[PDB]
Amino acid sequence: YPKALRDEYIMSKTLGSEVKLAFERKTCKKVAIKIISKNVETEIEILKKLNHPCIIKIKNFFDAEDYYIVLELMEGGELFDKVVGNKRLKEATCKLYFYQMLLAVQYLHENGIIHRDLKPENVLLSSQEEDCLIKITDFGHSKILTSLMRTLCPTYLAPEVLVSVGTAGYNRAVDCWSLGVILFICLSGYPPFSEHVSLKDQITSGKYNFIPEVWAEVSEKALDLVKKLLVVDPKARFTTEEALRHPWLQDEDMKRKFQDLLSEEN
Amino acid sequence: YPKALRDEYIMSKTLGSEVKLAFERKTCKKVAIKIISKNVETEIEILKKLNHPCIIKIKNFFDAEDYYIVLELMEGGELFDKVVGNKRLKEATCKLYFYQMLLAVQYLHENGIIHRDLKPENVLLSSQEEDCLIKITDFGHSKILTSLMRTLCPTYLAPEVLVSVGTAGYNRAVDCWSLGVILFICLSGYPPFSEHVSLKDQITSGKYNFIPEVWAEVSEKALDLVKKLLVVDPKARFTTEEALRHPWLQDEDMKRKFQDLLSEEN
Ligand SMILES: NC1=N/C(=C2/CCNC(=O)c3[nH]ccc32)C(=O)N1
Numbered sequence: 336y337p338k339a340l341r342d343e344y345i346m347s348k349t350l351g352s353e354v355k356l357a358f359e360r361k362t363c364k365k366v367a368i369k370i371i372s373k374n375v376e377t378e379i380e381i382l383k384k385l386n387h388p389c390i391i392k393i394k395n396f397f398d399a400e401d402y403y404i405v406l407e408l409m410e411g412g413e414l415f416d417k418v419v420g421n422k423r424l425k426e427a428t429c430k431l432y433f434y435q436m437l438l439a440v441q442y443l444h445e446n447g448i449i450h451r452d453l454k455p456e457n458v459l460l461s462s463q464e465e466d467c468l469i470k471i472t473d474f475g476h477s478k479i480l481t482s483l484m485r486t487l488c489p490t491y492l493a494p495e496v497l498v499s500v501g502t503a504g505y506n507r508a509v510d511c512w513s514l515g516v517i518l519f520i521c522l523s524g525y526p527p528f529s530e531h532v533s534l535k536d537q538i539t540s541g542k543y544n545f546i547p548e549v550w551a552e553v554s555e556k557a558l559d560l561v562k563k564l565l566v567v568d569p570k571a572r573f574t575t576e577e578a579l580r581h582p583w584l585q586d587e588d589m590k591r592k593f594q595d596l597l598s599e600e601n
Numbered sequence: 602y603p604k605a606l607r608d609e610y611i612m613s614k615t616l617g618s619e620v621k622l623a624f625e626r627k628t629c630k631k632v633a634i635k636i637i638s639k640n641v642e643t644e645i646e647i648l649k650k651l652n653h654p655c656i657i658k659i660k661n662f663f664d665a666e667d668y669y670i671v672l673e674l675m676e677g678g679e680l681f682d683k684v685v686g687n688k689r690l691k692e693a694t695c696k697l698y699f700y701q702m703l704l705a706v707q708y709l710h711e712n713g714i715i716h717r718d719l720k721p722e723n724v725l726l727s728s729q730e731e732d733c734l735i736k737i738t739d740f741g742h743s744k745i746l747t748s749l750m751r752t753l754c755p756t757y758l759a760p761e762v763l764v765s766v767g768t769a770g771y772n773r774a775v776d777c778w779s780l781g782v783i784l785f786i787c788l789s790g791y792p793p794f795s796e797h798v799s800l801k802d803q804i805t806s807g808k809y810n811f812i813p814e815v816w817a818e819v820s821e822k823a824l825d826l827v828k829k830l831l832v833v834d835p836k837a838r839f840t841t842e843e844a845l846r847h848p849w850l851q852d853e854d855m856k857r858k859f860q861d862l863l864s865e866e867n
Pocket residue numbers: 350351354367368369391406407408409410412413456457458459472473
């Protein structure tokens with residue numbers, strides 16, 4: 336560990352891989368430190384610009400030799416750990432986590448950011464209590480969306496750079512697909528696509544693995560949302576706005592719980 | 602002009618827009634200095650890594666305030682100036698310039714670089730003599746092609762990021778299209794697509810404006826090559842290798858002339 340950092344942080348045990356637990360040397364507050372060895376520039380620039388209760392905040396950053404990104408500690412661990420092993424969550428807490436997931440992602444998209452790696456390993460939990468805040472992480476591969484304008488306003492441009500352009504404004508739709516895969520998993524405890532017909536075909540065709548026996552402890556509305564995010568056509572697929580107006584999220588009690596949790600955090 | 606530069610270069614008259622003529626203060630050698638006001642990082646990194654008789658070499662670079670890129674001076678001007686105004690070049694010198702253009706672009710592509718802005722304004726001429734060397738410029742918008750590997754080696758990936766992948770290895774084909782538009786122009790003196798049916802449709806359909814009266818001072822082989830580069834399907838379109846084996850470039854006298862010109866330059 337570089338002198339500047341060890342000078343501020345007492346390093347400590349691994350939280351998984353590398354993310355370490357660490358305590359601020361002056362206050363003894365706990366924090367987490369993501370170590371990346373040698374578009375981290377991109378990650379940092381993003382994490383500094385963004386302010387949202389469901390998006391992880393950066394607290395510090397060291398560059399000498401490896402990158403160390405200092406972050407909020409999330410006592411609840413990654414959501415991955417709640418879903419491994421056909422485990423699976425109670426419908427009402429799926430609802431609670433997914434509301435938050437949709438608010439976060441809506442917020443990236445309104446700020447011209449596509450996350451591009453949404454998966455349960457990248458959704459963190461505030462606390463060990465079932466009802467809690469979730470913060471999304473890992474902007475290593477995100478894209479910040481002016482530049483249509485220069486290509487279009489011409490006579491030399493290949494016809495496929497052209498065609499390609501009428502696609503502009505739909506890349507964010509890969510995040511919505513990803514959220515639908517997360518939701519599917521949370522609701523059911525198994526993955527919709529899986530090598531357990533080949534992965535590629537499965538996904539392009541859009542035919543997720545649907546198990547009636549499993550989905551039967553799940554409401555019609557919830558399943559209706561997943562089906563609407565698992566649409567292969569990016570144009571027709573649900574956006575985060577649509578998913579937030581969907582009847583399943585019209586739940587003022589989960590809405591209630593959430594504002595309650597925002598408040599506890601302040 | 603920043604002190605470090607004026608200290609080395611006597612600035613002078615405009616060569617077009619900004620590219621200035623400039624003389625090295627110690628030797629009085631002439632050079633050109635491209636001024637970009639505030640992916641220049643990208644341009645420089647590229648120009649430093651590349652060594653090819655038909656690709657412009659960088660000689661120096663200043664960053665304080667505006668970017669100044671110091672380059673070879675090309676006494677012949679841009680090729681644009683030879684083709685403005687239904688002007689048009691003698692077939693045998695089209696051949697000579699286009700050989701060189703294909704060698705340069707082949708060389709970018711073998712080095713994983715796509716140029717992405719080939720146009721006559723970006724082909725420079727060594728000398729004011731009809732038979733001369735051409736160097737390609739302007740890497741402002743180029744792409745340096747590992748990363749398929751991480752997306753593919755999965756269960757969360759939108760079906761269109763997938764589909765999209767079987768496109769990998771064909772982006773270079775936008776350079777070949779562009780070269781075919783350049784060739785068309787050189788051979789005929791008019792543009793194949795033009796607002797003189799709308800630009801977009803023209804290009805996507807691939808129906809260039811073909812004038813029999815004009816093309817009649819042009820050989821069948823030459824026109825055959827253009828048709829083969831103006832193909833809308835990127836898979837079927839000619840690569841630089843194919844175009845170099847095409848009967849029109851099987852000319853050992855132009856081949857002769859060229860090596861002659863390489864030699865004069867040393
Ligand atoms: N996937 C991912 N996990 C991250 C962190 C860093 C953020 N905070 C954490 O508490 C944490 N617990 C275990 C891993 C983490 C992270 O930043 N990306």
